[PDB]
A paper describes a structure:
The N332-GT5 molecule was designed to engage antibodies containing a specific HCDR3 motif (derived from BG18) but bearing diverse VH and VL gene segments. N332-GT5 was designed to induce diverse human BG18-class type I precursors.
We determined structures of three BG18 type I Fabs, each containing distinct genetic features, in complex with the N332-GT5 trimer, and we also determined the structure of the unliganded trimer for comparison. Thus, the BG18 type I and III Fabs structurally characterized here have clear potential to develop into BG18-like bnAbs.
Residue numbers in the entry:
A (entry chain E): 80 to 127
B (entry chain A): 33 to 57, 66 to 141, 150 to 185, 188 to 309, 312 to 323, 323A, 324 to 397, 412 to 457, ...
C (entry chain F): 272 to 309, 312 to 321
D (entry chain B), E (entry chain I), F (entry chain G): 520 to 546, 572 to 664
G (entry chain C): 1 to 52, 52A, 53 to 82, 82A, 82B, 82C, 83 to 100, 100A, ...
The structure:
Amino acid sequence: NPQEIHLENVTEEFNMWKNNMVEQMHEDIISLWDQSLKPCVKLTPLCV
Amino acid sequence: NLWVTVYYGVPVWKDAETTLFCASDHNVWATHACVPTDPNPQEIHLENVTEEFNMWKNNMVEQMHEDIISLWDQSLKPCVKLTPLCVTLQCTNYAPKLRSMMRGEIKNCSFNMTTELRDKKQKVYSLFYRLDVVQINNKEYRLINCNTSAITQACPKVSFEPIPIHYCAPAGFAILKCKDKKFNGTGPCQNVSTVQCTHGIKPVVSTQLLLNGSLAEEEVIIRSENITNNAKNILVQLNTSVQINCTRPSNNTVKSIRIGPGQAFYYFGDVLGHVRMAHCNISKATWNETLGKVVKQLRKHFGNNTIIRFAQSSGGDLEVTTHSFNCGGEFFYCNTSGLFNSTWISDSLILPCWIKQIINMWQRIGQAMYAPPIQGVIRCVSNITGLILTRDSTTETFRPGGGDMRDNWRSELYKYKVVKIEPLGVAPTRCKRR
Amino acid sequence: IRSENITNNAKNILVQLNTSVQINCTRPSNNTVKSIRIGPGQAFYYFG
Amino acid sequence: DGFLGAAGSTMGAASMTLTVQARNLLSGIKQLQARVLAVEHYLRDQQLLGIWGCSGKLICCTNVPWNSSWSNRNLSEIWDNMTWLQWDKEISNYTQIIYGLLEESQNQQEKNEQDLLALD
Amino acid sequence: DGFLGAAGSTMGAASMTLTVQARNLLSGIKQLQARVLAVEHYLRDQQLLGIWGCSGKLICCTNVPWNSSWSNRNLSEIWDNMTWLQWDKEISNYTQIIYGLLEESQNQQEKNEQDLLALD
Amino acid sequence: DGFLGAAGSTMGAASMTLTVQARNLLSGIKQLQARVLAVEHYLRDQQLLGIWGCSGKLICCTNVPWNSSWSNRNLSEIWDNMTWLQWDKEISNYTQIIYGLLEESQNQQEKNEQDLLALD
Amino acid sequence: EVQLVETGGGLVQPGGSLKLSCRASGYTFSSFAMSWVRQAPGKGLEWVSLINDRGGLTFYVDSVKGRFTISRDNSKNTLSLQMHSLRDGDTAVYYCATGGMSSALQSSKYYFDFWGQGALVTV
Ligand SMILES: *[C@@H]1O[C@H](CO)[C@@H](O[C@@H]2O[C@H](CO)[C@@H](O[C@@H]3O[C@H](CO)[C@@H](O)[C@H](O[C@H]4O[C@H](CO)[C@@H](O)[C@H](O)[C@@H]4O)[C@@H]3O)[C@H](O)[C@H]2NC(C)=O)[C@H](O)[C@H]1NC(C)=O
Ligand SMILES: *[C@@H]1O[C@H](CO)[C@@H](O[C@@H]2O[C@H](CO)[C@@H](O)[C@H](O)[C@H]2NC(C)=O)[C@H](O)[C@H]1NC(C)=O
Ligand SMILES: *[C@@H]1O[C@H](CO)[C@@H](O)[C@H](O)[C@H]1NC(C)=O
Ligand SMILES: *[C@@H]1O[C@H](CO)[C@@H](O)[C@H](O)[C@H]1NC(C)=O
Ligand SMILES: *[C@@H]1O[C@H](CO)[C@@H](O)[C@H](O)[C@H]1NC(C)=O
Ligand SMILES: *[C@@H]1O[C@H](CO)[C@@H](O)[C@H](O)[C@H]1NC(C)=O
Ligand SMILES: *[C@@H]1O[C@H](CO)[C@@H](O)[C@H](O)[C@H]1NC(C)=O
Ligand SMILES: *[C@@H]1O[C@H](CO)[C@@H](O)[C@H](O)[C@H]1NC(C)=O
Ligand SMILES: *[C@@H]1O[C@H](CO)[C@@H](O)[C@H](O)[C@H]1NC(C)=O
Ligand SMILES: *[C@@H]1O[C@H](CO)[C@@H](O)[C@H](O)[C@H]1NC(C)=O
Ligand SMILES: *[C@@H]1O[C@H](CO)[C@@H](O)[C@H](O)[C@H]1NC(C)=O
Ligand SMILES: *[C@@H]1O[C@H](CO)[C@@H](O)[C@H](O)[C@H]1NC(C)=O
Ligand SMILES: *[C@@H]1O[C@H](CO)[C@@H](O)[C@H](O)[C@H]1NC(C)=O
Ligand SMILES: *[C@@H]1O[C@H](CO)[C@@H](O)[C@H](O)[C@H]1NC(C)=O
Ligand SMILES: *[C@@H]1O[C@H](CO)[C@@H](O)[C@H](O)[C@H]1NC(C)=O
Ligand SMILES: *[C@@H]1O[C@H](CO)[C@@H](O)[C@H](O)[C@H]1NC(C)=O
Ligand SMILES: *[C@@H]1O[C@H](CO)[C@@H](O)[C@H](O)[C@H]1NC(C)=O
Ligand SMILES: *[C@@H]1O[C@H](CO)[C@@H](O)[C@H](O)[C@H]1NC(C)=O
Ligand SMILES: *[C@@H]1O[C@H](CO)[C@@H](O)[C@H](O)[C@H]1NC(C)=O
Ligand SMILES: *[C@@H]1O[C@H](CO)[C@@H](O)[C@H](O)[C@H]1NC(C)=O
Ligand SMILES: *[C@@H]1O[C@H](CO)[C@@H](O)[C@H](O)[C@H]1NC(C)=O
Ligand SMILES: *[C@@H]1O[C@H](CO)[C@@H](O)[C@H](O)[C@H]1NC(C)=O
Ligand SMILES: *[C@@H]1O[C@H](CO)[C@@H](O)[C@H](O)[C@H]1NC(C)=O
Ligand SMILES: *[C@@H]1O[C@H](CO)[C@@H](O)[C@H](O)[C@H]1NC(C)=O
Ligand SMILES: *[C@@H]1O[C@H](CO)[C@@H](O)[C@H](O)[C@H]1NC(C)=O
Ligand SMILES: *[C@@H]1O[C@H](CO)[C@@H](O)[C@H](O)[C@H]1NC(C)=O
Ligand SMILES: *[C@@H]1O[C@H](CO)[C@@H](O)[C@H](O)[C@H]1NC(C)=O
Ligand SMILES: *[C@@H]1O[C@H](CO)[C@@H](O)[C@H](O)[C@H]1NC(C)=O
Ligand SMILES: *[C@@H]1O[C@H](CO)[C@@H](O)[C@H](O)[C@H]1NC(C)=O
């Protein structure tokens, strides 16, 4: 049951192009990807 | 009629050991987890404060040592591991008709290596220095490390140039700077000031001679843990520097082959001209005056009528018996015997130097590194700012000693002490709680 | 005698003794150990 | 002056710079451990001041008399001729004794306050 | 006695050892997380005492009357025949109700104090 | 309302929700660093309130007069027509000046209190 | 050793205002609390007012709490007393004096250590 509180008479300025939440999402997604691949078979015998 | 009164914020402290922060204004010493420095750092002079210092029990040195080793290893981790190199080599002399001191120093070796595909082999010819290659019994040779450890190739894009590093106290702690002129490393300092961060200390790595360090304010300062114990090192801080001009005059090229998917091995190719020995020049008059000043300061501890003799280092391996340093990215091992060849009784000097590509840093066994060759001709000029001496009747004998890197860092950290702030205290006053 | 459920035969029973019993264990043969190197800095120890 | 500038000054003069040192107490694993320890130390000192009833003061007077054995100097020598470093050294052996008495005094005061509040 | 020695004692007697338990609240990733949580918990309790106006006291009286429904025992049974563990169990369901009232009382007191200070 | 619900309300009305925002300030390496910084920030604000003598209050009156240059609006405009965001923007340049004066005032008060306590 | 010299006015009518001052030298002015004591022409001594060494704390006898203000300036080495109303019972020689209070970290005084010469206030 997450909450949301409406802010009356508040006009916050947004800028989606300077939003640092995107850089964190990018790093977190890459980190999870690499962690998933780390404990897996490394196919060095294939380069033949 | 006095009552206990509690005070918080009392300007007192106790000796303490804590973790210091990195600050700095690709490079092997560049640290990402290191805060930008303050363009206007503060220093607060402490009047009428006589703090006792002891540079030989300073825990800032152990942290500096661990941090430097950690950064070194982190830099080498994401690099090519040269396991395909420990193969039998067939070698001949690079310049069979050469009469300079480089005769027999460079060998032209052939080996099969590996290729990107597991099914193929290639034939690689490369030059190696004699000091990196051990004879098995063209002749058969192996790399010197094959009998001890694996080789990690240093990444060719990462510079070895020292970067000044500032150590900063955490909140609740302060760094006290001696500032007492002619301070010899122990005892009270009467000019103590409080700082947040140390000056920028360059992690310069060298043996025997300390390069690119600080100078003494008025006179050569001789510091030792126990000046009468011949098992301890003597650190001599000069008040004036001596220039040393080091060069690798040959114009060398670098070749590169691939040894696996995404892996590449860089190696020393043809010499584009004559083969010449690396060397360093020190002016004779400057050294003679510097050494005489050192002798006077030694006489103050050993006697006005004692004979002070300097001699070359005797036993040990090349790393300890020579002056080791990184110049241009190459590792030089200079003889130095011409600098410690005199008896003191009450135009230029040329030092031969050898180059090695396979090194074992920090006196560790089991973690060997291969330094890629540097393209072109190398020249550098360094400032000799201090010496490390050891001591061996009526005559004392001194030798270059060296080899323990924490002594080099002591020569910079000797003036700093870390203390913990103890803000609580009590005192009697005529003040009763109602 | 301790158990999570003494009537459930899928559970283990832990018996804590009030007195100990000595057990004398031996490997009577006098064995030697040999060692060879298998790589730079690597060594394999084996039963000789 | 700045941080610790009063360290060599007399106890009286240095008592006027308590906010300077107080501000500078708060101002990867090894650094997180150092910061957590700094916080725990700070909080222990604040808790100790709270126990004594000095939670909001830099200078706090109490009801524990000076025992003389701790120090038999008069106020003129202590406040005009000594520094806080010298005082800290001089009575180090008695610090825990003083702290114990301070705690006992506040416990009695809290009970007495409660009993006074109970009067209708 | 030492830490928690009063746990089995009556509520009255155990109220005399509050500093013993208070001192023992402050006294690689998993351990740093445990220490950070211990600090955050401690600070939340101190903030809550501050909100109620009890920031510097171990025993703090307020202006919220006892509602009887929470517990209809007399003072003799609560302070002489019960332990704090039994009391904690007995009124657990009403803890947040009491906390809410305590906060409301302090907010009114702060406004009233400000209004009294405004009188010339 | 809930957390920050009063952000768009007038300064007077929003002063009645201080406990709501106060509770929500406390409520692997990157997360530990974020939590340690949150704690250090909170403690610096509490230390600053302590230095000013406001360690236990959400609304705290002091002895520093308003200098007019900081803001020449009357109380009716500030408390009835402005929000706290607008006020924060309007006097940002003078925040450190005000803070400095607040510290000086408390230091004088502490000395004066001690001197009054010294009278037999 | 210590010179305390009062300066002041002459004849003032009831309902007026009169200011006295005291200059001091020969000791550190800022290190001592100071006070004013008055003597009616035919009577003995009575204490009138007290100021701390820092000047932040002032104390008065009830009879002058709404009439007299005591202040000091430690850079000018000057103690001042501003009196209003000045009823007939206030005619007296007013002396400035050093002592009478001590700031917790100093030993106790509770005596008047040094006296001036005295200004004569006639209503
Ligand atoms: C003691 O201090 C002196 C002075 O700081 C120091 O000598 C300096 O060394 C640096 C590094 O070798 C020299 O800078 C180089 O100059 C050459 C000129 O040919 C450049 O080619 C170098 O650039 C190459 O390397 C860079 C690495 O980051 C690459 O990014 C670049 O693209 C090139 O590949 C570099 O600029 C500097 O000139 C000298 N200074 C003097 C006066 O000779 C000395 O080495 C120090 N001693 C010790 C022991 O550290
Ligand atoms: C190392 O020696 C080999 C020969 O043993 C050199 O390779 C020869 O180079 C000459 C040119 O100078 C060619 O004509 C030969 O055909 C080469 N031989 C082979 C087998 O390739 C090699 O160049 C030497 N290394 C260096 C760096 O000069
Ligand atoms: C390389 O391998 C071949 C076998 O394919 C061998 O004949 C040759 O001698 C090897 N080269 C060296 C330098 O050992
Ligand atoms: C092999 O390594 C040992 C040290 O472990 C060394 O003593 C020996 O000399 C090395 N072999 C050669 C040929 O140098
Ligand atoms: C200590 O500092 C003073 C002033 O800074 C200076 O005159 C004095 O020579 C210094 N002492 C030493 C030993 O440097
Ligand atoms: C060497 O010393 C001289 C004179 O102090 C100085 O100008 C020069 O910059 C120094 N060089 C280095 C690398 O420290
Ligand atoms: C270095 O010390 C010598 C005396 O040992 C002195 O003559 C010389 O001037 C000093 N140099 C400096 C730069 O202080
Ligand atoms: C350093 O100075 C201290 C001064 O007390 C002296 O005792 C010590 O022997 C000195 N050491 C050296 C190596 O000069
Ligand atoms: C220095 O070493 C000598 C020889 O071991 C010893 O007798 C002397 O006590 C030592 N001095 C100190 C200060 O440790
Ligand atoms: C080193 O080179 C510089 C010029 O860069 C020269 O002035 C200096 O004398 C040289 N030093 C020696 C010892 O040759
Ligand atoms: C310089 O070298 C000569 C070599 O004979 C030596 O006698 C002299 O003492 C040295 N020092 C000075 C300052 O001349
Ligand atoms: C050595 O000579 C100096 C004068 O430069 C003198 O002060 C010192 O005492 C002498 N030492 C001895 C052991 O003769
Ligand atoms: C340095 O040169 C001298 C010249 O006599 C030689 O005896 C010595 O062994 C050399 N040292 C090294 C480490 O090569
Ligand atoms: C030491 O000096 C003498 C005299 O110049 C020289 O003959 C000898 O070779 C020198 N020693 C070394 C190791 O160079
Ligand atoms: C080395 O030789 C190459 C090829 O002749 C030339 O381009 C380069 O400039 C030379 N480098 C130096 C330092 O002489
Ligand atoms: C352990 O003791 C409890 C006592 O209530 C009993 O209910 C339980 O069955 C016992 N379990 C065993 C395994 O003896
Ligand atoms: C023990 O196991 C039996 C068989 O599954 C079950 O009927 C009984 O309820 C269990 N007892 C407990 C206490 O879980
Ligand atoms: C240091 O001592 C002198 C002499 O007592 C004193 O005048 C000075 O104020 C002292 N320093 C400080 C910072 O108090
Ligand atoms: C001072 O402390 C001692 C214990 O060190 C104690 O015996 C003595 O009674 C104390 N003085 C007073 C007045 O209580
Ligand atoms: C403080 O004690 C010393 C030493 O007995 C004495 O000389 C001094 O006069 C005393 N001061 C006071 C104010 O009692
Ligand atoms: C504190 O105890 C030490 C012994 O551990 C003693 O040397 C020192 O003088 C004592 N100090 C006081 C003030 O009693
Ligand atoms: C435990 O209960 C007994 C009996 O009521 C009581 O005398 C004793 O004090 C209690 N223990 C504690 C620690 O209060
Ligand atoms: C006690 O609490 C109940 C709610 O549980 C409430 O209805 C009742 O009015 C409260 N008693 C008083 C006296 O307010
Ligand atoms: C408390 O309540 C119990 C139960 O009704 C009763 O027996 C006891 O006497 C009461 N005590 C007081 C002091 O009212
Ligand atoms: C608290 O609520 C539980 C139900 O969740 C109930 O069993 C218990 O008796 C209640 N306690 C009180 C004191 O109301
Ligand atoms: C928003 O503005 C309107 C108009 O002034 C006002 O009635 C309303 O209460 C404001 N919102 C809040 C949350 O105060
Ligand atoms: C208001 O602040 C200014 C500095 O910005 C200052 O000059 C002025 O005196 C202040 N007003 C008062 C009444 O102090
Ligand atoms: C506040 O200032 C405004 C602007 O001058 C004015 O219109 C308003 O009446 C003032 N209010 C009060 C209460 O002074
Ligand atoms: C604060 O300073 C900025 C300039 O950095 C200025 O534009 C702004 O108007 C100033 N605000 C006030 C209230 O003085």
